[model samples]
Structures are given as C-alpha cells and as structure tokens.
Target: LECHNQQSSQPPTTKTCPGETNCYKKVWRDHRGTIIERGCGCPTVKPGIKLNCCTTDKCNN
Candidate 1:
C-alpha cells in the first residue's frame, strides 16, 4: 500500500465517543491531491483502548 504525504496545512482531527475511553476518536480528511492508501500497522487497539477509522462521510469503529 502507498501512503500519502501528511497534509502540512491541515492537521488530522480526532473525537472520542461518549463514556468511551477504551475507544479512540475517528480520523477524517478531505484529500486534495493524490489518494492515500496505506496499511495500518496497528489495526487493533489495545485491550482497553479502541481506535476508530473513518472518512468525512462515514466511520468504522
């Protein structure tokens, strides 16, 4: 998989769910240049921490 350069102008944002410390916030972005397709090294979150992945339109937790 190919990873796109991090957007220097725009930083990624995250939001945690209510009463959910085990779950992490989701990330979203409006890619303007090339598409970003990369593999997540740590797809699964820790036993107590959960990480969510998402786009501007939808999210997967």
Candidate 2:
C-alpha cells in the first residue's frame, strides 16, 4: 500500500496495483462513493491477449 500527494497542495491519496485480478476496490471514498468509475479496476493482460482492456486507448499508461 502507498499514499501519495501527486500535487503539493492536494490531499494525500492512496494507490495500489490491481495485480492480475479482474476486479479491485478503492479503500478510500471519492466524491461519488461505490461508483463504477471509482470502484473497480478491470483486468488487463501484459501481452498476447489483445483484449480491449489492454488496448492503448483503454490503458492510459
């Protein structure tokens, strides 16, 4: 687990890797708690799978 303040003036935020699983939950609450955009991190294979979740457009990084 890790907590980071991406900006000097922003609140501290925690970030974690979702690993190989297809689902994840945020331990901290955002403005809209339990919402799909905030609640889950879908799975993305490293290579060869060519899944939509792993596509460049879908994966920001």
Candidate 3:
C-alpha cells in the first residue's frame, strides 16, 4: 500500500478507507482533456478533471 502527493492538492480524502477495498481511483485532468494529475485515490475527486485505480503494477493503465 502507498500514498502519493505528486500534483493532487485537493480533497483530503478516501479521506480514508475504513478497510472496505483499500483501493482508490482518482483522475485529475481538466475538462479540456489536459492532464492535471494522474494517479490513485477515490473516484473523480476533482471538479473539472478525470484514470483508474485498482492497480498495483501501474496496471490501471
């Protein structure tokens, strides 16, 4: 399990998982299809952006 803070500086979420699936699927790209952040954490947490999670070997790609 890992946590990242590359370009994502919003939400403050899963804000945490109560075990459940222990997985996230966050995408941060503007509405214009311009990438803002691409990684893992919850579902579409950003407002104007959007990939997949459930990945371990970057398999979400």
Candidate 4:
C-alpha cells in the first residue's frame, strides 16, 4: 500500500485484495523452467505450476 508512495504521511488508500484470499502480491515471477503461462492465481489453485506466495515483507529481496 505505502510502497507506491514517496515518503508521504497521509498515503492515499484504495480497494485491495477482496473476497476469501487476503493477499496482495507486489511482485510476481514467471517460471523459466518450462513454457510458463502468464496468469494470476493462489497457491491452492495450482494444478501443474508449482508455486507459492510471500514469505515476509521483502521476501524476494
């Protein structure tokens, strides 16, 4: 939420992740091992693509 802002106290807010899943992915990576598809999905919804979600505040870093 505050990520896109530049040191502002009253950061503007808007609609984020809705429904059952409470997740807002900041960054996403495409699987380079095979012919990965460009899409957005949760971990449990996976069928072929083995993927997971965040680990921490700066997980990828």
Candidate 5:
C-alpha cells in the first residue's frame, strides 16, 4: 500500500509500505500544542492519543 509520511515540521510525502499494510495517521495533545504524524503501518494509540489506519494511497494524509 501507499501512504503519506510526515515528520517534524517538514512537508508531507508519499511512501510505499510492505505487503498488506495500511496507511496510518496519529494525533495527540501535548503541553506545547497538538502533535501529528503519518506513516504506513497498523494503527496505534495510548492515553491522550489518537490514531487511524486506512487502505488507500495517501490515506494517511
């Protein structure tokens, strides 16, 4: 699958994942402000965090 890959304050970009994986996007609140991330993998979460996975190209965006 293909997905968006974002890091730091840089612009988002596309990447290809391994077989049968989904695109994921994650968000959370922090003391400084809202934090965001995107990649290709299974979704994950924890206390005060949020994440999602989708099965389309650049869905993580």
Candidate 6:
C-alpha cells in the first residue's frame, strides 16, 4: 500500500510499502513537545499511545 512517511519536524511524503502492511499515523506528547509520526507498517499499540491505522492508499494523510 501507499502511505505518508514523516519524521520529526519534516514535511510528509509518499512511500510504497513492502509486503502486506498498513498505513499508520501516531501522535503523542513528551517533555520537549507533541510528536507526530506516520508511515507504513503493523504498529504496536498500548495505553497513552495515540495511533491510527488503515489499509487504503494514502490513508495516513
């Protein structure tokens, strides 16, 4: 699937995922500031971690 990939403080871009994977968007806050992450994969989830996953193309956007 296609997804949006973005590291800290950078503009988001498109990516072609390897194998079968889901597009994900994650957000959280820490001492420095709030953080946002996006990519393609089957991600881990637990308490206090905010994340969204989808199967469609460019779903993270």
Quick one: best TM-score, which candidate? Answer: 6
Model 2's lDDT to the true fold? 0.30
Winner by TM-score between candidate 5 and candidate 1: 5
lDDT of 1 by residue, 27-59 (tens): 334446433222222245445333454333212
- Model 2: colliding residue pairs: none
> How high is each candidate's TM-score?
0.21, 0.21, 0.29, 0.25, 0.77, 0.82
Whole-model lDDT per candidate = 0.32, 0.30, 0.41, 0.29, 0.79, 0.83
CA RMSD, predictions in order: 12.8, 11.0, 7.0, 9.8, 2.0, 1.6
Q: Name the regions of candidate 2 deviating beyond 4 angstroms.
A: 17-61
Which stretches of candidate 6 lie above 4 Å from their native place? none
**TM-score of decoy 6:** 0.82
Better of 1 and 4 by lDDT: 1
For residues 1-61, could you state the per-residue lDDT of candidate 3 as single tens digits?
3333244544432222233332444554555554434344446445644444563423233
lDDT of 4 by residue, 1-43 (tens): 1111111223433232223232223222355333322112234
Candidate 3 residue-wise lDDT at 26: 52
State the lDDT at 48 in candidate 6: 86
lDDT (10s digit) by residue, model 2, range 1-61: 2223122233434344343322222232346543222112444444432222221221312
Best to worst by lDDT, what's the order?
A: 6, 5, 3, 1, 2, 4
Please report how far candidate 6 places residue 4 from its true position, in Å. 0.2
